[PDB]
């Protein structure tokens, strides 16, 4: 059950003379099927924490044990394998490649996984079904709505059956009505047992998650574990 | 895989890619067209190079200038393996007839064996005869296209007086050969032939200059050559000089790599276009990095490695410049073939510019161009930080 | 002229892209202006030598003429000096070595200081060469070296000018000889015209030249000399603008091959301007919402491609002047005594072209930019 | 006084978007337009902004008839009279705050020196201090929309057309930007805005609802 396990994590962003500290003694653990929501002001480095967990950033000092094995320090070539298999990234603006249709935009992570073309289209189809996409999969993101683009983006986040879904303000480019539709989807997905860790500046949205975390000045400053 | 992502991107911006290719088409086809002609010109000399290996030129070296008797050369030519021999004069001539003129023709001085030995085919009138030598006759043969230039027709040319160098000559025949047809490239207005004894008597020059032996089995030349030279000195009497074999290649290669030089200078000027084309493909590749900075970042979040991106953007520029230098290589090969089916009013000689060495060199260059001008961008893209890009 | 400020803001937006786009046009205009300028120097040089061919009035009318009359007529007020010459283009051998179709002048006594042949080895024609009927010869510097390696080496040795033995008594040079290379003259040997008439059975005197060194006098004087030299026995420059034509042709053919690189450079900008338009469709809509017309956007995106090529042309021109000066120094071996450089017509021909390159290629994207719908853009 | 007066405005494409639109709007008003998707929500707005010309009917802007004017004419009218505000801000990336604000004044014929004065006055009106020369690269979202709102005000338009102004902004910073608009409405600038959120429409005086090309509700009756 135990997935994320940060420990004594620091991240200092050097910049000429400025050894500017952001994360400091981040201690944190996250178990499978959890729905954590991370909140806090600007400069707290929810960003820096999130990338640290998503393996897009390596911490200055400390440890990060993904499924028990330490992963801060792996070579880029090997680390990029771990990322492909374990992290499903969901972004605020949806980051759909505009020359690919929804289907093949969702297939993209399967290529880097090294999946056969037979399977890739059917894995994609099944997961576009899971997120409930009505407008046809053979359309560019040009001809898709907001909630439909974020659905595709979440399908793409799911295709390689990852351990963690990192979401960064998913409702942020969406209206209350269709945002609440996407937030139920995330609830339904986490109900099926898929772990989620979401950043938001919105109390209304953090409310949907099983566990609240707050950061002040790069220090985890209140959990719901105790 | 990395090849498919390459092709997808090119297809994504078709008219951008197309336009980029056109810069490489233009440049490759310019260089290949110029390189074709300069090669075809070169290869049509290298035909004559190997016809000349049947000949064995002997000359008077002063160190290991006495009058050379012709019957020495006939006696030397007895030597087994020697099929024929001949001796010649040469000179320049300005060749006026009526109101016409060809002011740089190379007037040759035969010796009764010459015409037969070199196998010149008489098309109008007669070849040199025995009478013409014993009468010291100022008689002249003209090559096919000298007769056409000077008298409208080989037939019409017969029994006309043509002033040679202010010296009246009577036209006895018109000849043609392979060599005469194609000898405009060596920079000659004509190849008229007369008796060596006429050249030697009209103009001051003495009557033998080049001494030649034809040896149709060419494998004998390394041995028969110096033997014919030795035999010449045994007959000439030891006049303290010694006859030696003239090297044929040191005067052919002297004009072979003068054509080569001047091909390179014009081929380079055309190459400037391919070089500009190259900077063009680099530049558009760089816009496709900044165009796709977020895309690369997303790709790396999904599991693209630096290495993947690096070879993807390489492959993408290579697909442009190869497909370019192939469309280009073809359109060159075309124009070259129709430039040849056109040069027929000047040359009777194979000029298609197919030359496998230049074809393969075009592709070899076309590859290098994409590889060279495509790495800085492909590098840039491979190094992009996912966090800064997202 | 906000379109010019808009153009420069855009150019400066992507500096290293606008730079790489300009480099196509620099590389293009440089190489075109270099070929055009050498070919122009070769033509302008030939054109200077025609204004020497007007200080030499030549009278022609055969009957056998006589130097006594030319000497007489040369007292006339404008006439600076005279000379009379003898011609053949015969071949100079020297023991296996062989120069082809050298222009063998046969001068009279006055010929040496009237034309001014500066001798660099030995001696010029003395009178005891005329009087004693000697077969002696002067060689030109480049004919001297080609036939005998050095200048001093050639001296006091035997040449075979068309067969006849001539003793090399000296070797000379001038500017007019050093450029005889370009008129296809194999060499310019001078000799005694007495010994050209003896050794070749040509007339002693065949050209009659009246040196007049007042340019604004050859009309009226020159026709008088022709009708004085006709009282005894009862015209204009030759094919000088023929080499002028032939060079200009070879300049074109080569300069056009260089010009392809400017055509690719031109498709260069068109490709970069086309991405410019797509990649700021949103700007174009924004601008039109702020009150930009169809026509405004049109002549903005056009001025930008014109400035971009025009700059490249203007830079390329400059870099093709440094290049077309050390080209001058390179051609102090081959041709030499030449003023090589980029004339004012050639210079602004390139500006007109580079401006025009920017326009031709740049109207197509500037149009696409102009017809963009603001609604779909935003 | 009266500024907007749409009467019998049809827009069709074969799809029909607007259908007998009849709306009047007076100076100083603050109208919030809401409606379901594809009601002609945006086609109305782009009609009022003169980016779309109706298939029939009439539109009087400050009393001037503008429907079916020429492209050159309708750009000047747009320039003098309309101040577009956008959800996504639409600032040019290579121009700093001051220059971005100066741009509509370039398309009017105003002195290069005077532009600088007017731009700084309107960066002041929107409480943006010491970021005169910042690029959008260097500004927050609130700061960006503040710059974009200054650009809408600089030409003293009759109308501020606003399309979900706080959509890219968080709820805190939206409320700040929404207050900014209210204050500008209090000083007397007319705002026709469009929004999907009732929390945002709340701020306006009047409340229009369009359903299928025709106005259905109107809190002014
Ligand atoms: Mg943060
Ligand atoms: Mg709508």
Numbering used by the authors:
A (entry chain B): 2 to 227
B (entry chain M): 2 to 65, 91 to 416
C (entry chain S): 1 to 61, 91 to 263, 273 to 416
D (entry chain A): 2 to 14, 20 to 227
Please give sentences taken from the publication describing this entry.
The operon spr0693-spr0694-spr0695 of S. pneumoniae R6 encodes a putative ABC transporter that contributes to the resistance of antibiotics and antimicrobial peptides. Sequence analyses suggest that the Spr0693–0694–0695 assembly is similar to Escherichia coli MacAB, with Spr0693 and Spr0694–0695 corresponding to MacA and MacB, respectively. Here we present the crystal structures of S. pneumoniae Spr0694–0695 and Spr0693, representing the structure of a MacAB-like efflux pump in Gram-positive bacteria. In summary, the structure of Spr0694-Spr0695 reveals some features for this family of ABC transporters, which are characterized by a unique 8-TM fold and an ECD/PLD insertion between TM1 and TM2.
The crystal structure of Spr0694–0695 was determined at 3.3 Å resolution. Spr0695/TMD could be further divided into two domains, a 4-TM helical bundle and an extracellular domain (ECD) inserted between TM1 and TM2. The two discrete 4-TM bundles are folded in a back-to-back manner, without domain swapping usually applied in other ABC transporters, especially in type I exporters. Notably, a short helix α6 (residues Pro204–Tyr212) of the ESM, which is located at the interface between the ECD and TMD, sticks to the TM helices via hydrophobic interactions and four salt bridges: Lys207 and Lys210–Glu374, Arg208-Asp49 and Glu205–Lys52. The two NBD subunits are somewhat separated, leaving the ATP-binding pocket exposed to the solvent. However, the nucleotide is absent from the electron density map, despite the protein was co-crystallized with ATP analog AMP-PNP.
